[PDB]
Write a protein that binds this ligand. Structure first.
Ligand code: AU
Ligand code: AU
Ligand code: AU
Ligand code: AU
Ligand code: AU
Ligand code: AU
Ligand code: AU
Ligand code: AU
Ligand code: AU
Ligand code: AU
Ligand code: AU
Ligand code: AU
Ligand code: AU
Ligand code: AU
Ligand code: AU
Ligand code: AU
Ligand code: AU
Ligand code: AU
Ligand code: AU
Ligand code: AU
Ligand code: AU
Ligand code: AU
Ligand code: AU
Ligand code: AU
Ligand code: AU
Ligand code: AU
Ligand code: AU
Ligand code: AU
Ligand code: AU
Ligand code: AU
Ligand code: AU
Ligand code: AU
Ligand code: AU
Ligand code: AU
Ligand code: AU
Ligand code: AU
Ligand code: AU
Ligand code: AU
Ligand code: AU
Ligand code: AU
Lengths: 170, 170, 170, 170, 170
C-alpha cells in the first residue's frame, strides 16, 4: 500500500472533479462544433473552444494520474450532455464558458478547503501548481473577451461578431 | 481494345460531366474578371474565383484522362457562355457559385447512381477519390462564406463587403 | 443551405456513432488508468489503452467534422460510464477491448448499409477512407495480442503477464 | 541577523530531517552494495539503490542550504547504521525501501504541520517545491515495483528476480 | 571637486525635472494597468502606456547620471500619485497623455532657458541630444493617435475603440 495521509473524502472529491473537468471538455467540444456549422461559421471561435476542450481533458488526466499516485481509486460516472444544443451568439457562448469556468474554479476552491481541513499538503501543492493559477488566467482572458465582444455590439452586432473572430481570435 | 466493363451510358455521361466542369471553369473565369473591374475592385474575390476556375479545369482534365484509361472516346460540345455578364454583389456572386456547385455535385451523384446500376466499381472508386469529397468540402466553404457575408450586410453593405474581401479572402 | 443528398436517418446514425466512439474513448481512458494503479502496475498496457482513447476521440471528431460538412446537426448525449470499474487481468482487458471494437465495427457496417440503401456515396467514401480499414487493422492487432497472452498463461500467469507487457507492449 | 519568522521548533525539526535524509542515503548505500555482492549480483538493483542514495543526500543538502538561508544553525548527529547488514531478496529490499520512504514522508508531513501551526509559509513553500511531490512520485514507483516483483514470484522466484532486474531495472 | 560652470539653479531644476519624469512614469504605469482591467481590456493601449512608463524612467535615470557627472547632488521628493484613478476612454487617456507630455516638454524648454541665461552649454547639449527631439517625436505620434481615434468615434465609439487598438496599436 502506498496510500498515506489521503482521506476517502479527498479521494471522492478528486473523482468528482475529474467528472467535472471531463464534462467541461465535452461542453467545449459541443461549443466548438456549433461554431463550425455552415450557418454559424466562426472559425476562430471554434478554434478557441477546441483548444479549451483539450485543456480540460488534460486537466482530468492530471487529476487521475495524481489519484493513482496517492493510492486512490479512479471511479468514473456518466458524463452528462452539455447544457445546450445550440449556443446562440459568440457573446452567449463566452458567457456560458465563463459560468462553466467559475463553477470549475469553485470546485477547485472547495477541494482546497477540504484538503487543508484534512491536513493534506500534497493535495494543496498539486492544485496550486497545475490548476488554481491556470484557471484564474483563463477566467481573466474570458472576461477580457466578453468586454471586447460587448463593446462591439449595439448598432451592428453582425459586424462586431465578425471582427472579433477575425482580429482577436485569429 | 482495352475497354472492359465500361458502358456506353457511362461513357456518355462522363463526356457530359466534362462539359459541365469546363462550363463551370468558364463561369468562374467570368466571375473573377468581373471582380477585377475598376468599378468593382475586389482583389480577394477575383482571386477566389480564379483559383476555382483552375480547379474545375483540372477536374475536367482528370475526367478526360479517365475516359481514355477506360477506352471511352472523349467528345466535346460547345461551352455555353456563363449565365450572367455582370454578377452583382459578392453575396450574389457567392450564391451563384453555390448553385453551380450543387448542380455539379448532383451531376456527380447522378453519375454514381448510373455507375452502381451498371456495376462499374472502377467508376465509383474514381468519383470518390477525386470528386465527391472535394465537392462537399467546397460547398461547405461557400456556405461558410455566405454566412459571413450575410452577417456583414444590413446597415452598411459597402463596409461589410470590403471587410470580407480584406479579412476573409486575403 | 448546403445540405444535399443527406438523409435525416444518416444524420441521426452519425450522431449515435459519435456517441459510440466517445464512449469507447472513455472506456479506454478507464482501462488505461486501471493499469496505472500501484497494485496493477503494467505501464505498457496503460500506454496501449491511452493511445486507443486518443484514436477513438479523433474518430469522433472526424465524424463530427463530416456531420457539419454535410449540413447535419451534431447532437450530443450523455456518455455512459464504462462497463466495469476494475478490469481484471491484461487478458480480461484485451477481451473487453476486442468486444468493444467489434461493436464499433458493427455500427460502422450498419451505417454503411443505411448509406447504400439511402444512395449516399459520399458517406460510403468517408467510412472507407477513415474507419473500416482502421478498425479491421485494430481488431487484427487485438486478436494477435489475445493469442500471445493466452499462450503465456497456464502454469505461471504472473510471469506471462509481465513478459507480455515488457516484450510486446514496449 | 537575517532570521525572521523562523521558530526554534522548526529549526530543530529541520536538523532532525537532515539526519533522516542522510540516514536514508546511508541505508541506500548499504542496499546498493549488497546487490553488487558476487553472491547476489543484481546490477540493476544496485543501480536503483545507488541513485536513491544520491537523491537522499541531495535532499539533505537542500534542507541544509535552506536552514542557512533562514538563519538557523545546522547541527549534525551521529548517523545510525542501516537497520540490516544483509537485505534478503529484491522483494525484501524493496519492501524495506518503501517503509523507509513512508517514514521520510511522514516526517515531511509532520514538519508541514509544525510549519502551518507556527505560521511559516516560506517553510511550507520549500517542502512543496522540493520534497512532497518527489516523495509521492517515488513511493508510487516503489509500489509499482513491488507489484511487479510479487507477480513474478511463486513457482520460480529465481527466474522472476532475474527478469525483473533485466527488464524493469535496466 | 569636479563641479564646473554648474549653477545651483540648474542643479535644482534638474532635480525637479527628474521628479517630473518619474511622476510621468508613474502615471503611465497607472494608465497601462487601467487598460489591462478585465472590464476595459485593451491590450494594445496597455502596451503603449507600459512602454512609455519605461521611456520616462530612462529619461529620469539619464538626468540623474548627468547630475552626477556635473557634480550636482540628486535630491528626491515624493512622487505624487497620478491625477486620476480611472482613465475613461482610449480618447480620454491619450488626451491626458498629450497634456502630460506638453507639460514635460515645457519643463524641458524652461530648463533650456535657464541654461542659456546661466551660459551652460553642456546642459544645452545634453537636452538636445536626449530630450527635445524625442519629446517632439512623441507628441507628434500622440497627436496622430488622437486624430485617428477622433475620426473613429461618432455613431459607434465601441467599434472605433476596438479597431484602433487592434489595427494601430498592434
Ligand atoms: Au472546433
Ligand atoms: Au475550429
Ligand atoms: Au475540434
Ligand atoms: Au488547500
Ligand atoms: Au492543505
Ligand atoms: Au474567452
Ligand atoms: Au472568448
Ligand atoms: Au483571445
Ligand atoms: Au481573377
Ligand atoms: Au484576382
Ligand atoms: Au484570373
Ligand atoms: Au457509385
Ligand atoms: Au459502383
Ligand atoms: Au465561397
Ligand atoms: Au466565397
Ligand atoms: Au474563404
Ligand atoms: Au494510461
Ligand atoms: Au501509460
Ligand atoms: Au492516459
Ligand atoms: Au456504404
Ligand atoms: Au453508398
Ligand atoms: Au490489443
Ligand atoms: Au492488447
Ligand atoms: Au501490440
Ligand atoms: Au550500487
Ligand atoms: Au550498481
Ligand atoms: Au554505488
Ligand atoms: Au505546511
Ligand atoms: Au505554512
Ligand atoms: Au522501487
Ligand atoms: Au524497486
Ligand atoms: Au523502475
Ligand atoms: Au500595461
Ligand atoms: Au499591456
Ligand atoms: Au506594464
Ligand atoms: Au539651452
Ligand atoms: Au546654453
Ligand atoms: Au499616442
Ligand atoms: Au495613443
Ligand atoms: Au501608434
Amino acid at each position: 500500500q502506498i496510500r498515506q495521509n489521503y482521506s476517502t473524502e479527498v479521494e471522492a472529491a478528486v473523482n468528482r472533479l475529474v467528472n467535472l473537468y471531463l464534462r467541461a471538455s465535452y461542453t467545449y467540444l459541443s461549443l466548438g462544433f456549433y461554431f463550425d456549422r455552415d450557418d454559424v461559421a466562426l472559425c476562430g471561435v471554434c478554434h478557441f473552444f477546441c483548444e479549451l476542450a483539450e485543456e480540460k481533458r488534460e486537466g482530468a488526466e492530471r487529476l487521475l494520474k495524481m489519484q493513482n499516485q496517492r493510492g486512490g481509486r479512479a471511479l468514473f460516472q456518466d458524463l452528462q450532455k452539455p447544457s445546450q444544443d445550440e449556443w446562440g451568439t459568440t457573446l452567449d457562448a463566452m458567457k456560458a464558458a465563463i459560468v462553466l469556468e467559475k463553477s470549475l474554479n469553485q470546485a477547485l476552491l472547495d477541494l482546497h478547503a477540504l484538503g487543508s481541513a484534512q491536513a493534506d499538503p500534497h493535495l494543496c501543492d498539486f492544485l496550486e501548481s497545475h490548476f488554481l493559477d491556470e484557471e484564474v488566467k483563463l477566467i481573466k482572458k474570458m472576461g477580457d473577451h466578453l468586454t471586447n465582444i460587448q463593446r462591439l455590439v449595439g448598432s451592428q452586432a453582425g459586424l462586431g461578431e465578425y471582427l472579433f473572430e477575425r482580429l482577436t481570435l485569429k
